[PDB]
Design a protein around this nucleic acid. Structure first.
Lengths: 98, 79, 127, 206, 113, 96, 150
RNA sequence: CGAAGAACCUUACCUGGUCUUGACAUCCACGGAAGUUUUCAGAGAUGAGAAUGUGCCUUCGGGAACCGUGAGACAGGUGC
RNA sequence: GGUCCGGCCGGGAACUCAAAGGAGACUGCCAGUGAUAAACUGGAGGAAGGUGGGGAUGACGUCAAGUCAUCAUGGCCCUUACGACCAGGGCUACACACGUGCUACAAUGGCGCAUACAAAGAGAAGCGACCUCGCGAGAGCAAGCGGACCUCAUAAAGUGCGUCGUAGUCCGGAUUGGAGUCUGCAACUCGACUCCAUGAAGUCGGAAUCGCUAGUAAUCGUGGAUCAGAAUGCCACGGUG
């Protein structure tokens, strides 16, 4: 009944973001969850390598953007910490929706 | 090819009709609007549709308003 | 209360839960000719399992999903070899000389730039 | 192109991007453009000090002005009046408020962009050419580095035909994936054209 | 009957041979059969004493034969008389579908020569 | 597309809001999807020359209508260039 | 190439079991359709089975092991020949050549269904006639009539 | 292939209509809060009205946005 | 355990699955060979042995190779303009030639019924279920979802039957005509899609030449991006093989 979307590109960053919040969440409820990792909403492109000619060589980039959700299922009064007070990261969907 | 079921009557013919409900033929109508499909009152007139270069008068018939009037002016010539 | 073996074949991954027994041949509350499309493959993939013998030592109950039709029947092979090592290692060895404890060393390969299919580089004539 | 000049796969394995922010999938675009525009105005108002590199951080409700320099002696100016003004400019393009962040030192011999814009200023005053890049690489080897390799376009003496300015010394592997390859570019704006500048320092191993 | 237009073919399914009725085709066949409440498992060979009525009746409801072949070809000259695109393109042989006459159009120009 | 060509389109996208804001629901809904003759026409065709159909979009940074990637605000060159110096987050050489 | 080629496992017929019979599916694979193949196989088997003695495996197997070649001709300038020199092939490639030729031979028939085509052709393999056989009789004709080393 | 779809616009090209510190820039000065919906005429581009809104600060001039005009230094150039 | 038999319900986290963190493989070990050097050939254990597979990985260089048109830029030239703004046209001509693809020439098949299993992506100027209406494309009504949730989605070849019988046809779909649909202000040269009709050429391609060494080729679909609205293109994913 709570979806707090942690959504960042590379996992060597989403996990630092996970680990700054997930500590207080331990105490929090009695049916709280670990970080549910989901599949990857993935993007990836291919754009033409050059200012002109050919199309057998395009530069390929990738960009995973996997989607953790710790959650704090079953509300308490202690929710405020991991909601607002310990998260405000740039590269990660900060989500304060319940 | 198609007109859907929204054929354009056009407004730049609209003006013509109001200067043609008191006058029959008096000029070759300088009309740049191609995408028309004209009312009978305007049929029987020399509608000079624009063909990207200069206009050409078209002695409209009813079967030239089954379809755009642009189509009945060549906009290129082959030889 | 069950004994497991895997089932990882080219896109079709498979749960396989053994009741010890004999006298069943079911796969998805269905059976071979009810679950498979009636491919050729499905009849074939009974043979490598009868080497160390089956439906006389084990009941077949399979719950595979995802991947191909043939891939599927493939997955049976990668599940039952795996559930035919969990009772003795004598089984296992003749499954590895069978080559169906080996996970399929082929897998669908990526398209690459300039390629019109997975490894088909456009025909030309320009010389 | 020679190689593919790599340094963006090398921010894809080690060290976050230089413009880390998050947005929704079609909310990306707005957030994008606003950033690259803001970075431009930023680098012009920030050429008063030697740019090691600006980077930005946006959690989409503020942005962070996180210039690092070899001249924080100018970035301060007098107290906090200086940067205060510069923030106002930020506020225009990218519509959110901004907050100033610290500029750390490590010597302009270190980190590739310092050694870029420097040699470039020399060249636009029309001196050293051969010797220009060279002096700045004997510098960088003097203290620190595990090899620097500069490359700079040709056109010695200002001349019409280019003949590449290339000197390395030490070791710069350029295919390592346990790598510590710093890389930035400059380009001169000479009275005869454009000299691309490339600095490749192998600061360490990781 | 053999009805309007000479010949109805036989030694094959009812729907099939009905496709060979110069303006009746794939759908239009099985549509008469559906109408006339009759099968296609049976051939035309068998020509039912029911089906025999509906032959002329349903092909009489459609524009077919001479009637159609008239109207169409009356209209190729209709536009032609009015300086239409569709018009003059018919006397050069040209298409009207925006086709490739840089390369192709070898059903409008005839084949490579 | 050149400095000028961009410009053309900026003003087109600007003017879009003066034929598509309040005018937007007016241009579309209240004027289409039935309602419907020589009326609807001259109303809807208010200039002819601004509507979101007529928006050619292009980049906000360098223009050009080819190469474009509307979803992400980016275009051909403005991927490679930028991404490399790490000016777009998340991007790295492909290996899916 | 470095080293020499490996072997690649192929599964025999399930209903009767003969690797060689399954290598005949491989030869009949076009469109990749192994499914629609497994039909034709049995379809030709029965034709054979009635009309002919031996096993049903030796309605194919034996009958074919006498209209398969034992010489293939290529050429090289090693030996001092500019000519097409006989080559005694491995027994497996013996098969492959004939199997292939027999299958070309039933798409040259319009005798209805790749069943009935390919069927009657293989029945005449034991009867030693049909343009499938005569390819041997052209290779081995060349080689032995115009021998130029071996 | 550039071109990750070219109906108009795109679009550079052409034919016509049309403009000339300018479509797009900065800077200086003036008027007018910015603006709003419409009319006529024109193919539109536009051009000229007609009614209506009276913002932020002021030292009451000025500015800050923004719009036209004026004057140039300039501006524009997918021109080579 | 429930079942109104559907992961639909609680329940269970075993399992797949995702996907972060490890475990691993290094010629390390066994035999032979070798110089009792590396290494080579076989072998074992193991998911895998001897660049494991596939990416990314483009050396120092060469072609005054391309790109002043993404952008940048030295010079030169244009300045009531090759500037600038708009409507229409032209970009998709054509009497032809050539290149890269797509679809067939058929029963390894086509069409008709029903039926078998997917993977990976997409999304609030969006995809759009449901129900109503439409032969249909689709439209109307609108749920749901900014999303492992819902919508795109029904995978299609395949399979079991029905048939047609080797005919230019029951093959094949071009052309055109008519009728219609959708996005737009409006599809005239220059839109796609559907509907019915018309029904093409073609009965496997001289000379020649190219691709492709395995999950490839072949063939069959699927998804994306650009997309108001036009994919036999490109880009990606799996099926059989």
């Amino acid at each position: 009944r709570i979806r707090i979307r942690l959504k960042a590109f590379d996992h060597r960053l989403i996990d630092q973001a996970t680990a700054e919040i997930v500590e207080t969440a331990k105490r929090t409820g009695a049916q709280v969850r670990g970080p549910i990792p989901l599949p990857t909403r993935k993007e990836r492109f291919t754009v033409l390598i050059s200012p002109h000619v050919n199309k057998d060589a395009r530069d390929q980039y990738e960009i995973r953007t996997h989607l953790r959700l710790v959650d704090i299922v079953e509300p308490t009064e202690k929710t405020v910490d991991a909601l607002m007070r310990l998260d405000l990261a740039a590269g990660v969907d900060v989500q304060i929706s319940l | 090819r198609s007109l859907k079921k929204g054929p354009f009557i056009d407004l730049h013919l609209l003006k013509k009709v109001e200067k043609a409900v008191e006058s029959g033929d008096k000029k070759p109508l300088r009309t740049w609007s191609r995408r028309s499909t004209i009312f009978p009152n305007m049929i029987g007139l020399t509608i000079a549709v624009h063909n990207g270069r200069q206009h050409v008068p078209v002695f409209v018939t009813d079967e030239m308003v089954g379809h755009k009037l642009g189509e009945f002016a060549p906009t290129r010539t082959y030889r | 209360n069950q004994y497991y073996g895997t089932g990882r074949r080219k896109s079709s991954a498979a749960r396989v839960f053994i009741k010890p027994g004999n006298g069943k041949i079911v796969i998805n509350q269905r059976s071979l000719e009810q679950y498979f499309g009636r491919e050729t493959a499905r009849m074939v993939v009974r043979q490598p399992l009868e080497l160390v013998d089956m439906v006389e030592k084990l009941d077949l109950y399979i719950t595979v999903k995802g991947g191909g039709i043939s891939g599927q029947a493939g997955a049976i092979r990668h599940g039952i070899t795996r559930a035919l090592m969990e009772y003795d290692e004598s089984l296992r060895s003749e499954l590895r000389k069978a080559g169906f404890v080996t996970r399929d060393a082929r897998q669908v390969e990526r398209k690459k730039v300039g390629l019109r299919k997975a490894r088909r580089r456009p025909q030309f004539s320009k010389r | 192109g020679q190689k593919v000049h790599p340094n963006g796969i090398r921010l894809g394995i080690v060290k976050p991007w230089n413009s880390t922010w998050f947005a929704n999938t079609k909310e990306f675009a707005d957030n994008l453009d606003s950033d690259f525009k803001v970075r431009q105005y930023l680098t012009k108002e920030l050429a008063k000090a030697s740019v090691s590199r600006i980077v930005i951080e946006r959690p989409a409700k503020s942005i962070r002005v996180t210039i690092h320099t070899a001249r924080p002696g100018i970035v301060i100016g007098k107290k906090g009046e200086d940067v205060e003004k510069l923030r106002k400019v930020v506020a225009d393009i990218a519509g959110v408020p901004a907050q100033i962040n610290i500029a750390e030192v490590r010597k302009p011999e270190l980190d590739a962009k310092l050694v870029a814009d420097s040699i470039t200023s020399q060249l636009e005053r029309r001196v050293m050419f051969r010797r220009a890049m060279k002096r700045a690489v004997q510098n960088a080897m003097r203290l620190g580095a595990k090899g620097i390799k500069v490359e700079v376009s040709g056109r010695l003496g200002g001349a019409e035909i280019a003949r590449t300015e290339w000197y390395r010394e030490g070791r710069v592997p350029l295919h390592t994936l346990r790598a510590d390859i710093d890389y930035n570019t400059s380009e001169a704006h000479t009275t005869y054209g454009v000299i691309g500048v490339k600095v490749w320092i192998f600061k360490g191993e990781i | 009957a053999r009805i309007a237009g000479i010949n109805i073919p036989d030694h094959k399914h009812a729907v099939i041979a009905l496709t060979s009725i110069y303006g009746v085709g794939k759908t239009r066949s099985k549509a008469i059969l559906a109408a006339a409440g009759i099968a296609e498992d049976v051939k035309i060979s068998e020509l039912s004493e029911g089906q025999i009525d509906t032959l002329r009746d349903e092909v009489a409801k459609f524009v077919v034969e001479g009637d159609l072949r008239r109207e169409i070809s009356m209209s190729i000259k209709r536009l032609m008389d009015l300086g239409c695109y569709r018009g003059l393109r018919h006397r050069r042989g040209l298409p009207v579908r925006g086709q490739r006459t840089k390369t192709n159009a070898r059903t409008r120009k005839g084949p490579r020569k | 597309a050149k400095q000028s060509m961009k410009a053309r389109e900026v003003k087109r996208v600007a003017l879009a809001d003066k034929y598509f804001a309040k005018r937007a629901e007016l241009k579309a809904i209240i004027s289409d999807v039935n309602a419907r003759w020589n009326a609807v026409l001259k109303l809807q065709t208010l200039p002819r020359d601004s509507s979101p159909s007529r928006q050619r979009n292009r980049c906000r940074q360098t223009g050009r209508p080819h190469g474009f990637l509307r979803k992400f605000g980016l275009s051909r060159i403005k991927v490679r260039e930028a991404a490399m110096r790490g000016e777009i987050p998340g991007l790295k050489k492909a290996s899916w | 190439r470095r080293r020499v080629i490996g072997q690649r496992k192929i599964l025999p017929d399930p209903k009767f079991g003969s690797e060689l019979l399954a290598k005949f599916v491989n030869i009949l694979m076009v469109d990749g359709k192994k499914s629609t193949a497994e039909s034709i196989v049995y379809s030709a088997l029965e034709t054979l089975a009635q009309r002919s003695g031996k096993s049903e495996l030796e309605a194919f197997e034996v009958a074919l092991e006498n209209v398969r070649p034992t010489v293939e001709v290529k050429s090289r300038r090693v030996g001092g020949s500019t000519y097409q020199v006989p080559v005694e092939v491995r027994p497996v490639r013996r098969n492959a050549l004939a199997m292939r030729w027999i299958v070309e031979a039933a798409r040259k028939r319009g005798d209805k269904s790749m069943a009935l085509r390919l069927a009657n052709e293989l029945s005449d393999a034991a009867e030693n006639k049909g343009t499938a056989v005569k390819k041997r009789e052209d290779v081995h004709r060349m080689a032995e009539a115009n021998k130029a080393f071996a």
